[PDB]
């Protein structure tokens, strides 16, 4: 229904250039999700669209959790759209932890939401914190997917670097598949220097 790519493009959330990503791969694009989430009206509309997919799955989500900082707004709007509670994990002494008095009930059905899933590494660190507290991780969610992890309802395949488990669904609005080059085989490196975004 919502034109996802046009939303991100109009918001100037799509940076074109030469970037060294967290996976070690070089790309001609980078996504700045904060440029979309800056607008609560856009964030709500995207979260309502995401919730439709989640509800079709009948997973009985009781709580949405996000790893701080970037995943916070997306997960929070998703929790509002689902009519459930929202909690977040944060890095304390360089390790993911659940603070702020947030508590998890034993076997609480939690969806781990991010603003964007690249490798799914931060989402996995968040899920491990919750599982150790007795929670059941039933799904992963994101507004945008980088085509590294496979999302539900897509004909794309999971790639090298994917960290999310194969037995749990990932729900995302769209796949933002960019050129991914190995650093020793990057065509952009011939013309410019790759910078960390």
Q: Which residues contact 182 (CB under 8 A, 6 or more apart)?
A: 25, 26
170 DSSP 8-state letter: E
Contacting Zn ion (CB under 5 A), which of 19, 26, 27, 72? 26
CA dihedral 142, 146, 49, 73 (to 10 degrees): 40
Our CB check for Zn ion shows the closer of 163 and 194 to be 194
Residue number, 18 or 146, with CB nearest to Zn ion: 18
Total interface residues for Zn ion by CB under 5 A: 5
Q: Which stretch binds Zn ion (CB under 5 A): 30-38, 90-98, 139-147, 187-195?
A: 187-195
Single out the segment in contact with Zn ion by CB under 5 A; choices: 26-34, 85-93, 142-150, 152-160.
26-34
69 is in an annotated binding site: no
* Residue 188 C-beta: closest distance to Zn ion, Å: 4
Please enumerate in sequence order all residues whose Cβ is within 8 A of that of 9, keeping only pairs 6 or more positions apart, or say none. none
Tell me the residue ranges of DSSP E strands in 45-179: 63-67, 85-92, 95-97, 109-117, 136-145, 170-175
Helix/strand/coil for 130: helix
Contact pick of 11, 159, 189, 197 for Zn ion (by CB under 5 A): 189
116 in a known ligand binding site: yes
Give yes or no for a contact between 7 and 32, defined as CB atoms under 8 angstroms apart: no
Shortest spacing between CB 177 and Zn ion, in angstroms: 17
Determine the interface stretch with Zn ion among 22-30, 64-72, 148-156, 169-177 (rule: CB under 5 A): 22-30
Nearest CB to Zn ion, comparing residues 40 and 187: 187
By CB atoms closer than 10 A (0-12, 13-18, 19+), residue 122 is: buried
Q: Which is nearer to Zn ion, 158 or 188 (CB)?
A: 188
Sequential DSSP letters for 74-88:
HHHHHHHHHT-EEEE
Residue 188 lies near Zn ion (rule: CB under 5 A): yes
DSSP label at residue 183 = G
- Residue 87 has φ and ψ, to the nearest 5°, of -135, 165
Q: Return the residues of window 147-186 that contact Zn ion according to CB under 5 A.
A: 186
115 is in an annotated binding site: yes
* Residues that constitute the known binding site: 114-122, 146
Summarize as ranges the residues that interact with Zn ion (CB under 5 A): 26, 186, 188-189, 194
């Amino acid at each position: 229904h919502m034109d996802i790519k046009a939303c991100y493009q109009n918001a100037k959330a799509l940076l074109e250039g030469h970037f060294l990503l967290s996976s070690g791969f070089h790309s001609n694009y980078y996504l700045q999700s904060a440029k979309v989430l800056e607008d609560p009206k856009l964030a709500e509309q995207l979260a309502l669209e995401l919730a439709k997919q989640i509800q079709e799955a009948h997973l009985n989500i009781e709580c949405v959790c996000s790893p701080a900082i970037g995943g916070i707004l997306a997960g929070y709007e998703l929790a509002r759209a689902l009519g459930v509670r929202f909690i977040f994990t944060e890095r304390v002494d360089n390790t993911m932890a659940l603070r702020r008095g947030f508590e998890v009930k034993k076997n609480e059905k939690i969806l781990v939401c991010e603003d964007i899933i690249t490798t799914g590494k931060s989402a996995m660190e968040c899920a491990k914190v919750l599982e150790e507290k007795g929670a059941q991780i039933v799904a992963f969610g994101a507004l945008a997917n980088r085509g590294i992890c496979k999302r539900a309802h897509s004909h794309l395949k999971a790639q090298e670097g994917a960290c999310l488990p194969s037995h749990l669904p990932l729900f995302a609005l769209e796949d933002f598949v960019f050129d991914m080059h190995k650093p020793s085989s990057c065509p952009l490196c011939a013309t410019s220097v790759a910078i960390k975004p």
